[PDB]
């Protein structure tokens, strides 16, 4: 009789030393070479990863009864925190979902700022050996850890602070005290002791900075402490002369009448901070979602609707291909969300943000009152890879930085359309053989 887990360690699934932590997660369908290095939820929750006490899931959709089953046995009835954001009826069906499981409770999430959502994405494991923090890209329902392509940045195991002592445990990067703003914003009684076991651990090792959206009005220099403005202060202050802006999403915004009310000036302004850039925006094509891994359905969670894209069709030009060669997801639509800076010849990197934030202004912030305040209706969370955390000035791409897609990006061709989800394509069949009629 052996111990089952008897020559298995984390480092079957982790890659130990590697500075970035950056994982995709496992997709189902592919040839196994494209899941080595993966992760699945179950990976990151197994008994390998620590040995559990408590956690808490920040997230936007979720499947409670699927969401319990990626917990190992042994731990399903440890207290588990679901922080959403539904009101009413989406509220009172959650907490029809959690009943049944009693060691889970719900935190809502304020949205006072009209149409904004629960959108971050992470993870806090309590275990008795330290806390990990997890924040990554995938809803907790199976659909989006199955034919997906997700991102998941993971903490070391930071250890706790012992009792009687006393140390900042933060990192260069002021991982912890941004951490611990970004959760103090949601003034929840229910994260209070969420925020002190923060307090408690030793987050020194931490080497990306936090990128939050949180809902609100900031004036003044609190305009520097979320979404585009906290991006853009970073880049001042921790990061290159024609070197492009990538930006790759699963759902567009209303950006305004044209490029100039807020793409090109406030956002693209921001993210070529560092210290006639060209722009490239990669949204999946009809044609990427139709020979997709599960055909025009993969559409159903790439919500750019008709109504919003005909009053933007100038953005369109922006537009490139979802190719993923490199890691073997090219028919896996993307669900991740990434803004990287990289050299003319593609061949680095100036920085890399994988995030929860769509290409919105609810997520990324509009200024308003003659660019005095900076208005934000949605929760978001990213992490962002800056060289200089390394002692690097830039990264090489493939010190090596995992870019999940293809460089360079691939404009769409004459024949190919961005996603819209609400309208029907009716001329060529998916995948499956289907075709695809909303309503």
Same mark, same amino acid.
């Given at each position: ?9 984390? #480092?079957?699934?982790? *890659? ?32 390998? %990863? ?11 959709? %979720? ?11 042994? %731990? ?6 679901? /922080? ?13 979902? $959690? ?33 990990? /923090? ?9 659909? @989006? ?31 912890? $005290? ?15 002791? #969420? ?6 651990? *030793? ?30 202060? =970073? =880049?001042? @202050? ?19 009448? *044209? ?17 006639? /850039?060209? =722009?490239?925006?990669?949204?999946? &094509?009809?044609?990427? /979602?139709? !020979? ?21 069709? #100038? =953005? ?9 060669? !490199? ?22 990197? +100036? ?5 929860? +934030? ?42 090596? %930085?995992?870019?999940?897609? *293809? ?31 909303? &309503?």
């Amino acid at each position: 009789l052996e111990d089952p887990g008897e020559g298995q360690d984390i #480092w079957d699934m982790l *890659d130990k030393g590697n500075p970035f932590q950056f994982y995709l997660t496992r997709v189902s369908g592919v040839k196994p070479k494209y899941n080595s290095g993966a992760l699945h939820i179950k990976d990151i929750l197994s008994p390998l %990863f620590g040995t559990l006490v408590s956690s808490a899931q920040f997230n936007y959709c %979720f499947d409670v009864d699927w969401l319990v089953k990626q917990y190992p046995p042994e %731990f399903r009835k440890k207290p588990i925190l679901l /922080v959403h954001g539904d009101k009413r009826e989406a509220k009172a069906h959650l907490h029809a979902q $959690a009943k049944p499981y009693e060691n889970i409770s719900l935190c809502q999430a304020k949205l006072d700022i009209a149409f904004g959502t629960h959108h971050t994405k992470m993870m806090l494991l309590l275990y008795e050996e330290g806390l990990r /923090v997890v924040i990554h890209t995938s809803n907790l329902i199976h659909a @989006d850890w199955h034919q997906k392509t997700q991102g998941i940045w993971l903490s070391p195991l930071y250890p706790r602070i012992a009792d009687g002592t006393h140390k900042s445990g933060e990192s260069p990067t002021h991982f912890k $005290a941004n951490l611990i703003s970004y959760l103090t914003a949601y003034n929840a009684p229910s994260l209070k002791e #969420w925020i002190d076991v923060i307090h408690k651990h *030793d987050l020194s090792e931490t080497n990306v900075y936090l990128i939050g959206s949180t809902p609100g009005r900031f004036q003044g220099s609190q305009k520097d402490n979320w979404g585009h403005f906290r991006l853009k202060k =970073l =880049l001042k @202050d921790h990061a290159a002369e024609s070197w492009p802006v990538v930006g790759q999403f699963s759902s567009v915004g209303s950006l305004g009448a *044209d490029e100039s009310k807020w793409l090109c000036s406030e956002f693209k302004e921001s993210m070529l901070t560092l210290g006639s /850039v060209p =722009l490239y925006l990669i949204y999946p &094509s009809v044609e990427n /979602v139709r !020979t997709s891994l599960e055909g025009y359905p993969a559409g159903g969670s790439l919500p750019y609707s008709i109504q919003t894209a005909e009053k933007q069709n #100038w =953005l369109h030009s922006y537009f490139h291909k979802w190719s993923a060669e !490199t890691s073997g997801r090219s028919n896996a639509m993307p669900h991740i969300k990434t803004y990287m800076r990289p050299s003319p010849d593609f061949s680095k990197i +100036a920085w890399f943000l994988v995030t929860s +934030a769509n290409l919105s202004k609810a997520a990324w912030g509009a200024l308003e009152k003659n660019g005095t305040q900076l208005m934000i209706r949605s929760y978001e969370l990213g992490v962002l890879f800056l060289p200089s955390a390394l002692g690097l000035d830039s990264f090489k791409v493939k010190a090596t %930085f995992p870019v999940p897609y *293809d460089l360079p990006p691939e404009l769409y061709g004459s024949k190919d359309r961005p996603w819209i989800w609400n309208i029907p394509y009716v001329k060529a069949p998916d995948t499956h053989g289907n075709m695809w009629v909303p &309503s």
